[PDB]
Amino acid sequence: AICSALPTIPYHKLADLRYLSRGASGTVSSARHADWRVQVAVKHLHIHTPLLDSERKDVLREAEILHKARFSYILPILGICNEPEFLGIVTEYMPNGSLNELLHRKTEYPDVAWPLRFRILHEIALGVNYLHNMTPPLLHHDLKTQNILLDNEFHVKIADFGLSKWRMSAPEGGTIIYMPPENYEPGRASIKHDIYSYAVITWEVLSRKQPFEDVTNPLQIMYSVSQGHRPVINEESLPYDIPHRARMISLIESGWAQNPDERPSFLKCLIELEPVFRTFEE
Amino acid sequence: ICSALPTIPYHKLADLRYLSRGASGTVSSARHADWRVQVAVKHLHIHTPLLDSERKDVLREAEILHKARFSYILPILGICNEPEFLGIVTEYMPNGSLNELLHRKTEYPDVAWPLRFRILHEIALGVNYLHNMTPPLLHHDLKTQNILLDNEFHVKIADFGLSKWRMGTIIYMPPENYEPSIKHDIYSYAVITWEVLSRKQPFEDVTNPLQIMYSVSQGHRPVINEESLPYDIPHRARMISLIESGWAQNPDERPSFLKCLIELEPVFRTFEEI
Ligand SMILES: Nc1ncnc2c1ncn2[C@@H]1O[C@H](COP(=O)(O)OP(=O)(O)CP(=O)(O)O)[C@@H](O)[C@H]1O
Ligand SMILES: Nc1ncnc2c1ncn2[C@@H]1O[C@H](COP(=O)(O)OP(=O)(O)CP(=O)(O)O)[C@@H](O)[C@H]1O
Ligand SMILES: [Co+2]
Ligand SMILES: [Mg+2]
Ligand SMILES: [Mg+2]
């Protein structure tokens, strides 16, 4: 049993802690590791409140998942900082933010060239396919453009394993826009959540649009999706000059199909799309 | 918190092609049939039956790579462990080795300074990480052929075949290793630094390795002059000073990698992003 231990990073080795992002459940900060001399990201529980023991278990579980799931397109975990009053997952620092920022910050990024977009889509599928091929399979359950991070040369690192589950009545978690309709309510199709999210991501990458942008109430989105409505496919959302437009639309519509049986495995998706990805030059 | 190294069944390796044969094994490219990625496979000779001592060497190397994972270390993806096949499966590095970058002058007429300095910085970060493990991992075979370059020319340190937990060419070896070794890696790094900044083969004109060994034991080192190291090398004086400490006759005069990074960080910092 060849084993790799996740390093424990003592608190005094984290220098220059700076707020990057605060959320509901925790905070992401940048830091430098004083000994390794690299920039890191630290995803930690709130510094304000005392540390709840159930919150501690959630962080340890996420850290273990990241550690086990390591692969070319998955955010590398560097260690865990586990202290009486501080608990943080230490990962590689991603200099180029998230796919969300790339797609929707149109002043910062006026042009996002097709080969880059297709490489991003290919790398996401490779990352998730890897997760689904683990024993037991790891299901991400929160794939979205905000959780696809971009390294120094805009290669994909899938992040945020907070809702992930090993496949071994309540529905799984997720973000509503990227969630298939069968996951909305209590009461086998669990494995087809990630591909649905990927289809919405693909639509979002090729359009540079917010899915369901005109729909102001998320409950209306949920009602419409449960009736089979999806982000709009027309000349306006998806211009005619998108490379391999017909094949990509066909794949999207299978990926987000109402019937989960009509959605491909990620392996199937890769087999179907490899000829498309291959047409692009380095 | 434990991570298991995957066992990759032989039937999942497709399109096996010879890349490089050495004395102890062979490196082949392949595709993983399920993961749909290109891989490199470092395996024992397909011709001979598999000696059990050779098997243990490969397993030991695989374990070291698995434990040593870090941003500047070659990622191991799994082990293929079969009755008649034994191979370490790693990420495929598209841009070869630092050796090829430096010495294939038709293929690479210009290697710009910011790239060279970034490479030197990343090597030191990789080795510093190894030396900071508990117990420390000593590489003991650092050379330009063992520094691999990924798709955007970032460093992955490879070849852990001679590595040791702290409980072939002699040009990168300090003299105390062959006098008739905690400071071995930094000595190799000093020679690598000279090689990166010069684009020259260390001791190129010395035809007998025994002459190299004798000369080094007497304090001779790769030549530092205007010809080997041009005056227009950024931070030339500081870099020469560092090199000469890194390969100092007395191992006590050679820095830790942490010390080397502390001393060189201001130099590395002057360069803009590529
Ligand atoms: N390694 C990393 N490098 C650089 N930035 C990172 C990073 N990890 C996270 N971030 C930034 O922090 C933000 C939140 O990270 P993440 O999604 O994992 O936290 P979280 O799970 O607590 C949000 P939520 O509670 O909504 O699920 C990311 O969108 C990104 O901007
Ligand atoms: N992941 C990888 N990706 C691409 N090429 C690789 C590679 N790993 C090794 N190579 C190539 O094979 C060559 C030899 O690899 P490596 O040094 O690890 O084997 P080895 O230890 O058997 C040689 P020696 O017997 O001299 O020690 C490398 O220099 C490189 O050209
Ligand atoms: Co498990
Ligand atoms: Mg989350
Ligand atoms: Mg070797």
Author numbering:
A (entry chain B): 5 to 172, 183 to 201, 205 to 299
B (entry chain A): 6 to 172, 188 to 200, 207 to 300
Task: Tell me what the authors wrote about this structure, in their words.
NOD1 and NOD2 (Nucleotide-binding oligomerization domain-containing proteins 1 and 2) are cytosolic receptors of the innate immune system, which respond to intracellular fragments of the bacterial peptidoglycans, D-glutamyl-meso-diaminopimelic acid (iE-DAP) and muramyl dipeptide (MPD), respectively. Upon ligand recognition, NOD receptors oligomerise and recruit an adaptor protein, Receptor Interacting protein kinase 2 (RIP2), through interactions of their respective CARD domains. RIP2 also contains an N-terminal dual-specificity ser/tyr kinase domain (RIP2K), which belongs to the TKL kinase family (Tyrosine kinase-like). RIP2 undergoes auto-phosphorylation and K-63 linked ubiquitination at Lys209, becoming a scaffolding protein for downstream effectors.
As expected from the phosphorylation profile, RIP2K-AMPPCP show a typical active state, within AMPPCP bound the active state between the N-and C-lobes. All essential functional elements are in their canonical positions. The R-spine is aligned, the DFG motif is in the expected IN conformation, the Helix αC is inwardly displaced and Glu66 in Helix αC (Glu91 in PKA) forms a salt bridge with Lys47 from strand β3 (Lys 72 in PKA). The AS is close to the loop containing the site of ubiquitination Lys209 (residues 200–210, referred to here as the Lys209 loop), which is also disordered. Within the dimer interface, the 2-fold symmetry related N-termini (residues 6–9) form anti-parallel β-strands. In the RIP2K-AMPPCP structure, there is an extensive hydrogen-bonding (H-bond) network linking together Helix αC and the ordered part of the AS with their surroundings including the N-terminal anti-parallel β-strands.
